[PDB]
């Protein structure tokens, strides 16, 4: 509250980690259905259907421009990446597992580089 904070968590390297992160997302095999946004000409349904569309680069953007204003708003872009994936894929199609088996390699790295 007024004048009283808890103890400063150093957040100074937080934008450096992320881009870490976000490196080893890219470059993991399964990134393909996620490098670059879905063509909503060229794909039917997904305009309508997710409102919110997002997708690695889009996220490199925002981090490289200082759209992000904390490592949490950061995170609920990654994940929303993966949200989007289960809504619009089945689970057993290549980009379904893919999508599974992303998540996964992100909430690992997430938690032993920040908990």
Same mark, same amino acid.
């Given at each position: 509250?007024?004048?009283? +904070? %808890? /103890?400063?968590?150093?957040?100074?390297?937080?934008?450096? &980690?992320? *881009?870490?992160?976000?490196?080893?997302? !890219? =470059?993991?095999?399964?990134?393909?259905?996620?490098?670059?946004?879905?063509?909503?000409?060229?794909?039917?349904?997904?305009?309508?259907?997710? +409102? %919110? /569309?997002?997708?690695?680069?889009?996220?490199?953007?925002? &981090?490289? *421009?200082?759209?992000?204003?904390?490592? !949490? =708003?950061?995170?609920?872009?990654?994940?929303?990446?993966?949200?989007?994936?289960?809504?619009?894929?089945?689970?057993?199609?290549?980009?379904?597992?893919?999508?599974?088996?992303?998540?996964?390699?992100?909430?690992?790295?997430?938690?032993?580089?920040?908990?």
């Amino acid at each position: 509250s007024m004048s009283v +904070k %808890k /103890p400063k968590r150093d957040d100074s390297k937080d934008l450096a &980690l992320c *881009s870490m992160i976000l490196t080893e997302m !890219e =470059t993991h095999e399964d990134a393909w259905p996620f490098l670059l946004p879905v063509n909503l000409k060229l794909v039917p349904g997904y305009k309508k259907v997710i +409102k %919110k /569309p997002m997708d690695f680069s889009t996220i490199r953007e925002k &981090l490289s *421009s200082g759209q992000y204003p904390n490592l !949490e =708003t950061f995170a609920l872009d990654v994940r929303l990446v993966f949200d989007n994936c289960e809504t619009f894929n089945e689970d057993d199609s290549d980009i379904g597992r893919a999508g599974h088996n992303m998540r996964k390699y992100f909430e690992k790295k997430w938690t032993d580089t920040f908990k």
